[PDB]
Symmetry: D2
Subunit: 247 residues, 4 copies
Amino acid sequence: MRILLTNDDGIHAEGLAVLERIARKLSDDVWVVAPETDQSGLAHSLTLLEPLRLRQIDARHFALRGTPTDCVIMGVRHVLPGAPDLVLSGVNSGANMADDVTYSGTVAGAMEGTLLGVRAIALSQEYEYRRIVPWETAEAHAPELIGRLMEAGWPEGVLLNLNFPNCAPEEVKGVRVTAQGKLSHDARLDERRDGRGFPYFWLHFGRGKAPVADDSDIAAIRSGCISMTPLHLDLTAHKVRAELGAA
Amino acid sequence: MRILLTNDDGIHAEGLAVLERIARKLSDDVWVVAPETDQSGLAHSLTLLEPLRLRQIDARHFALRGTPTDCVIMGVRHVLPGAPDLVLSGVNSGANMADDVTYSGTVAGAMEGTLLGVRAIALSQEYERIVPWETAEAHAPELIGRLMEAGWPEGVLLNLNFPNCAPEEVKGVRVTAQGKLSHDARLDERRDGRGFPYFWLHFGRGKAPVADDSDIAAIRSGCISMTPLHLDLTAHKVRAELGAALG
Amino acid sequence: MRILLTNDDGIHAEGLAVLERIARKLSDDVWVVAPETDQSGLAHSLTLLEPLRLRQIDARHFALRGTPTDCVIMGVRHVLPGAPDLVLSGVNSGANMADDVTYSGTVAGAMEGTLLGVRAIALSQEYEYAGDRRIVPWETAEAHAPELIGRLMEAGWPEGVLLNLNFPNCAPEEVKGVRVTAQGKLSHDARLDERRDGRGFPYFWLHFGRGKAPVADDSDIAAIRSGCISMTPLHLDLTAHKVRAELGAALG
Amino acid sequence: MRILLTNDDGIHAEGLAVLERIARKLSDDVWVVAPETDQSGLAHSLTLLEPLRLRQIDARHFALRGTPTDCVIMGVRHVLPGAPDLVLSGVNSGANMADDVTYSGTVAGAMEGTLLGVRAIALSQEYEYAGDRRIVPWETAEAHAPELIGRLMEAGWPEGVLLNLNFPNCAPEEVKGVRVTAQGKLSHDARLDERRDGRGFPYFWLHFGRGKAPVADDSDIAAIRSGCISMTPLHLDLTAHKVRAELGA
Ligand SMILES: [Mg+2]
Ligand SMILES: [Mg+2]
Ligand SMILES: [Mg+2]
Ligand SMILES: [Mg+2]
């Protein structure tokens, strides 16, 4: 019933307005703590070296000069009158799938909710080009999905990662419980000079359309299905522990 | 044989000098690409929104105004004459165990090595700061040698923690699971020199029960801990509870 | 007739909305390039080491992640179709008087206009606290600025000089008049407050003890304390010309 | 006798090692508070919105994550055991003349010293490029600055005025002399170079050149172009006094 919202696109981004409309279908007790600005690539980082600055827009909406992870902690530990029952992060402008999950500020917001002991869901909306994001699709489908998930709980320590395909609402083919996909890791550095002549680089990622696993988040979205992947924060490769020849 | 080093403590930090002495026990072909400044809590974030600035100290040592993840990408894709055979990240001033792994720049350095297709190890030294660097320094070379000698699986990185003991006092080594600690985030509220509010975020140690197979338990016992980690975050066991759809 | 606006309070600050209303009393050809956020203390600094990021709000309003000086240069050299005839900077939330001038982003916005060859005016509005909130009587700058600027533009003033305008904290109909003032001099009371962060590491806040000491009767400060609008002509030649001849053996 | 040094080039920059050598010709009581990194274009800005972080290198050398202005305040009010008698700011890598003075971190260091009630001098060294390596003839400032500052300190100068010193790009023994100059007026040569980042998003670099135009024969610029050291007394009253009477009206 007490729902806390954050995102990585910023307090003023349309995706967050969309999330709050989704949230209000589930409860009236909604709280928003979101970054001041875009947080692309910020992953699960938080702000320890500099002060956090909190800006109140109204008694339920706050912007924070910090990461999504900072936002969730601020919400849970300072802003709300008690722990939220659900944390929602998004709706991101652009999908978060496969190896994105490690780098995603939207996914990290949910993670943080989960580390704080709260049920948490990340939501991301695939689009096409500039951006025409079919927000109505997440908006039409997210409420009932979250309602069902909340009704059937899910395990402690696991968060849900939802991606909505670039389709019109009535065109989405269905929903699938997926696994995290894998794409080729295509990091690229572009070297330039700044006009006082000093070198610098831009980092970006080539995002190829290669084959992925048929049960992946990617494959689902390519098929026009909503993807729901349960994710956890234990990174141990348990199957590997036994070797250990010789410890 | 080609070894790339990075850390989160910065190019000038003693932990990185320690790592390079360790690395030189394994090969003379060592390359260093490390942040300009000491930077906690950066996790697996990278720098997309601003330029990266690379600074050459000598032919094998480079500082980068960016994250450990940026450092590994720069090293692999731009600075080295070909892919390294091994990426080492650390030796961090402070342990990285249990829920730290999600937030650790030191660990993310290794994660990035792995995502680039390279065997990778993160190394961290528990302290009280008085950091008993000599302990990691005494024990790391042989451990890494054995690990390299035995393969380990593709997609898995190793997370090594050394206890706060004198070198001759360490009790042994254990292949461990990632522990789970209680989330212990603290916000201190203040007012700046102009009266305006701000917050400091920091973390205490939390109060969880330690599993006897965890990284934490090993370190508490005076043992070196080695946890194999992987980058598939799917909670596979949970997928089947999909009511009511496929996967 | 072509007017460019900027400020140091940010694209979304009320003082900039105020300045645009004033500007529209003087022309319909108004352009706005302003910082994304608050710029206190940024003086005449500009951004050389990092990229500038421009954001278009509409055809005449742009936010820039940079300083008020960066804004003017962006406006003059990139955004507008030709040089503005007038650069206005403000209306700042708080006065910019005396030793402030060297540090003020608002004043710098005008300085940059002037160095770019354009008539330029900085506007600032004095306020009072209740007791933490600022109550800024924007209506005062709003009521009085249009005619003052119109008269100044009509009479013209020398090239290389910018005007620095302060409005007192009075209701519009209470302002006692306007004075051409000199820059005042306040006691310089910079203070360092030492603290420890959440992890125990030291840091400092820099702040300034303000205080009501006596100033020169022809100063900007004195005028504002009297309830008068202050107009100080400023220039960008810092040479202490009177002191050059004073010599310990060399030409010039 | 107590001398505080700062710069805009940063605690590790050669120009600050040069300045300390110059300073030690004048006193053995020298204190250094300088920025952690390069501070081009920071003018007289200071740090109000974020914390200042101070780092001790030696008992006499400190780096501050902040502006030259912040450094001088820190040095005067906190680090030194009492006010310095002299603040020196530089030796900058590159001249600071004419309309540079308004933008210059090095000059602002000296400005702040003056506002804090201390005699202050900014020092800058003109250079040239060999391709892209700047070759800065530091030896020129080094050779000439100690005596000039000695004389200046021996003769007083007025309260509220700072001195801006520029050394020409000449070999030490080739400098033609010294001149008390006026601040020049250059052409403002700014432009904006538009690019796209790794993700396709626009950004600009702000390029500021020098003007390339004729200047007054008594300016800092004309002196330096002639191979002379330039010394310009500057003050912090920006009032255009000659214009006030005109303006009422
Ligand atoms: Mg986003
Ligand atoms: Mg560290
Ligand atoms: Mg302001
Ligand atoms: Mg410099």
